[PDB]
Amino acid sequence: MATGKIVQVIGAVVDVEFPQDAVPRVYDALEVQNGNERLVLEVQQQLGGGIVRTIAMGSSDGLRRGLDVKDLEHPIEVPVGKATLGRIMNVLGEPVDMKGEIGEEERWAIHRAAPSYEELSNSQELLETGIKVIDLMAPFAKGGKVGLFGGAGVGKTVNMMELIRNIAIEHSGYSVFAGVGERTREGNDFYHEMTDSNVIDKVSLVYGQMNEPPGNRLRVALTGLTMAEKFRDEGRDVLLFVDNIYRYTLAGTEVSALLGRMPSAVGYQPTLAEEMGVLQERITSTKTGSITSVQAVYVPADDLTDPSPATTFAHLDATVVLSRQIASLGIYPAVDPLDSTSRQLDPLVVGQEHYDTARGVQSILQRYQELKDIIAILGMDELSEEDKLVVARARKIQRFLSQPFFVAEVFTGSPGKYVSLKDTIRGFKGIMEGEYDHLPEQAFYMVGSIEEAVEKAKKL
Amino acid sequence: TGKIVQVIGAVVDVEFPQDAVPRVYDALEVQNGNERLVLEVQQQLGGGIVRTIAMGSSDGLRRGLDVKDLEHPIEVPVGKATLGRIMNVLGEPVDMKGEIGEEERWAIHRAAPSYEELSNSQELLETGIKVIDLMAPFAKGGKVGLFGGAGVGKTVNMMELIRNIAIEHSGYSVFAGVGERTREGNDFYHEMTDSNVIDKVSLVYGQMNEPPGNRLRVALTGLTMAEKFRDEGRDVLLFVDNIYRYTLAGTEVSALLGRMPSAVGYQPTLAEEMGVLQERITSTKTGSITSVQAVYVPADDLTDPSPATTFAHLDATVVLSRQIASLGIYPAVDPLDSTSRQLDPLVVGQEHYDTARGVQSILQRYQELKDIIAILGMDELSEEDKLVVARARKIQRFLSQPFFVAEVFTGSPGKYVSLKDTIRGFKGIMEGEYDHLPEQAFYMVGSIEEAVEKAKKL
Amino acid sequence: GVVENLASEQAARMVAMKAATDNGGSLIKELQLVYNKARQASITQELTEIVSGAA
């Protein structure tokens, strides 16, 4: 039976009134027949007598007052398990790829409490990603979080595609991709790239596209989280990719403004720092398994200080900042080595070898920054014999950080390269010791591993 | 038949029988003591209540007064008989002469002409002002706007344009004074009358003394008169003395009409209030309206919503600035911010266009150097950047001109400079053929010959 | 003559950099008036947009 009735519709916000015996709880899901179609509503507030204010998870058009509404007496709950690998799903766990029903055994509610501080476990096993600059300058451990900061067009999304491809191919680990506010063009390119690279069978995808109401864009992060949690309980180590935190916070701001809450610091909702914690606190490694996360975060207008990026910093363990200047000189992955950072970069965890290589590289690049502006004025011949050496080695090091990705082959035709951490440390530590002072600079550009620089120098 | 039921400031609420309620924009009438007050209804609330704005002083109104429903909008005299006379917002005569012997009356609320009727005219219109018709020339039938803060010269400029166009022009002309000083309306009325051009100019005044209703509706009256002259087949000049007061008078009334505030306290309907006016002031196939509008900029902030939404409605925008007037350089036009639709090679010719673009280029390059000049002084400049700075300052001086209406302020007599005579002078200054004169040789002169002369006398 | 010109160059650079440091200091105090005015304007606009949205 259907005990409720709609009493208002204002845009995406729908009020439904039930008999006072059977008011839905908060976050319950209701259901209504929007013409020849089905629409689910999520309860946000129990206000007044029998009346409940909700957000529509779909287009609100065509809703009349007085329609019959039925309350599913449970939150929105989605399919989980192995059945979801290789599928695309919307916030409600329905397939949007036309391959038919999901086939799931089990469904989990997307609202659940985070682990208690004693269920956690801290283990410092570094992830190996296969990207030179990331492994070297910004190591991150299982269970930790990484933030790809930067403006627009720098490479956050293709860097995440590359990380997914490596993890899936070279380490056989599962992955989940939550497209919070995803551009359908990029979502389709991502689908065809994952299926062409032959990794789709180890990723499960969730898309809340931009053309969907705010409620869809908001709750998608929790659906991706719930799938990643199901994989964790099986004892696996999964990796959760969130395609933009900035659009999670924007969907939260819109949902807040619709419900009429009194706004806050720069138009952001009041609950901003609580939504961010509700999300980021379920991503942890427990004694049974581990969820690692890497998260793209758009910085609007380069200021790193307005609430949206400012609040997320509190939760990250490493930060990789991408720069459009570096990208325009053509050295992708476009990671800035000097501003990217990690909490795990200290000797007690990465060993003295890796630590000294990282700090030596940063010091050489920092010195080349100084020498650039003398080279500009006095010309280069006014440099010492040693300083011309720092210059040549800094330029080689700066070439060597670039790498050809497997997913970028569509842009440049060049085949991709996967570089282990041993090769990274060995190559950089060799360059900084004058072992390769006889090769030309361009021998190191987009070359992958160090042993392929000596091969490329023969051909130049 | 109606009763007053509330009086908040300038807005009055009136209660009518259920079936007798007035339509929007109808006019009601009250007897405020030994006075007759006109109310224009703005909104129909539920239950026979109707909300109005008082076209007069609101004081003295009790609750429960009886108001009479006149069944028509505000209508104003129009046509040839309204010519050479001063009128109220309600179309009443305000000079001490007799009644206006009009044959016809029009409602001040009208729809803008259809897209099918509009007309387009590249016919350039010369004004003897160097900066305006070098940088931002305008055409017969086009719209011009003078943007500026308080006290920078956007009324003196409008009176000089009146002098240079509206005496040397045959058709009729209209002047609407929206929310400005009555002193200046009187001075203008007598300047006209003491030179016998008054009997081809029609005046409407809603000056700043008057309560918000008058300043709110007085622009539509001037437009209605101009539209009558346009439809007769003539071509008309319409000068509006400050169009910013037409929206400020809306901001004053807006909150009392029960509308939620918007960006900087402005009414939520700002862009529509402004468009539904600016859209009926246009030329058409049957006749043309040429206009000049003074547009006040609050707090000198050109990004304020009210100036910002106006730039889109004008063809030539002349942006005056305080940081130039306080150098004594009049007219204080900013050439890096003035602009015209007509400044195309295909409309003004390659040489005029190219001179204007070169002048903008020099003055912009001079703006870029001001910070280094301010920190490190002028001696660190390249040997050719000092030359750019010298020619830029010479160009800034030469943009100045003595107006005929500004004799009262400076003694020096006015000058009229033709276009042929100004592009020549600027081409000269740019090509370097006057590098030997001092800057002051250029300040406040007519053509370039008068500068070459003033240099002899220092 | 060369050595005297060099000493003269050093003295002129000293006094020119003195002038430039004073010119920078006198410009900080203009930029701070601008900054304060903008700070106040933003506080006012934000707090009005909150209070006037309620109810």
Ligand SMILES: Nc1ncnc2c1ncn2[C@@H]1O[C@H](COP(=O)(O)OP(=O)(O)O)[C@@H](O)[C@H]1O
């Ligand atoms: N490693 C790369 N190789 C080649 N092209 C790249 C690479 N990274 C970024 N690009 C270029 O940048 C564009 C957008 O990159 P993307 O990562 O989507 O930016 P954003 O981080 O803003 O999403 C791509 O279309 C591609 O042309």
Ligand SMILES: Nc1ncnc2c1ncn2[C@@H]1O[C@H](COP(=O)(O)OP(=O)(O)O)[C@@H](O)[C@H]1O
């Ligand atoms: N061509 C000019 N020569 C000298 N002074 C001028 C000239 N144009 C404007 N001014 C000065 O501009 C001042 C501002 O007057 P006005 O134009 O009425 O400002 P507003 O535009 O606000 O009405 C005048 O008092 C006058 O001294």
Ligand SMILES: [Mg+2]
């Ligand atoms: Mg992206």
Ligand SMILES: [Mg+2]
């Ligand atoms: Mg004035």
